[PDB]
């Protein structure tokens, strides 16, 4: 149970890239899949897919 | 009485008709609500009169 290197807090460019990635992943949710915004959402969605 | 600061709040007389005091926010809200509750009956009241 080792640990990984913690990178320094991101600069503004890295924050903007993170925001862009989050919004692009937000755009991918089908409108007929009613999963709320939460930390586990994506995980839940994956689970749901497998369940289906 | 706390010096000349009259901390007393009720001053409720005998044959009192309403709330004991209106120095608290809850009772002020209740008094205003009751007055305006009695305001909104006119038409209904008038209706029954004619009946």
């Amino acid at each position: 149970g080792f640990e990984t290197v913690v990178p320094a807090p991101p600069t503004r460019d890295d924050e903007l890239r993170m925001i862009k990635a989050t919004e692009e992943q937000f755009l991918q949710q089908p409108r007929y899949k009613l999963y709320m915004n939460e930390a586990h959402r994506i995980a839940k969605m994956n689970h749901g897919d497998r369940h289906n | 009485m706390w010096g000349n600061l009259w901390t007393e709040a009720s001053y409720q007389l005998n044959f009192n008709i309403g709330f004991s005091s209106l120095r608290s926010d809850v009772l002020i809200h209740l008094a205003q609500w009751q007055y305006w509750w009695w305001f909104w009956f006119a038409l209904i009241w008038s209706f029954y009169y004619f009946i």
Binding site: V6, P10, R12, E15, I19, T22, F26, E38, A39, H40 | -
Partner: protein
């Protein structure tokens, strides 16, 4: 969101959505994250505005909880996880900083 700027979370915009996605739905840290979104509205893009917003987060954490002078300056890890609750000024500061990071424009 009694401490934030907007009546409902939908007026916050994309930043509030990212704050919701950051923590689990029962985690009260989201509200603190929302305050970060409030601190970095016209400040994130300005190079010194970002530092000002981080200072605002530090002041907010110091005002919510009793804090010591060096306490918020010696945090080893500023990363947050889903189950991070605002039980300490360090957690409040981390949530506020994460909210600041997610404020585009």
């Amino acid at each position: 969101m009694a401490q934030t700027a907007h009546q409902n979370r939908y007026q916050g915009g994309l930043c509030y959505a990212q704050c919701n996605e950051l923590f689990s739905f029962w985690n009260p840290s989201i509200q603190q994250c929302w305050k970060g979104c409030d601190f970095g509205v016209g400040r994130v893009n300005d190079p010194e505005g970002r530092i000002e917003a981080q200072q605002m987060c530090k002041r907010w954490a110091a005002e919510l909880y009793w804090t010591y002078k060096g306490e918020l300056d010696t945090i080893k890890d500023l990363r947050v996880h889903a189950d991070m609750y605002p039980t300490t000024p360090q957690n409040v500061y981390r949530a506020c900083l994460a909210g600041v990071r997610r404020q585009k424009f």
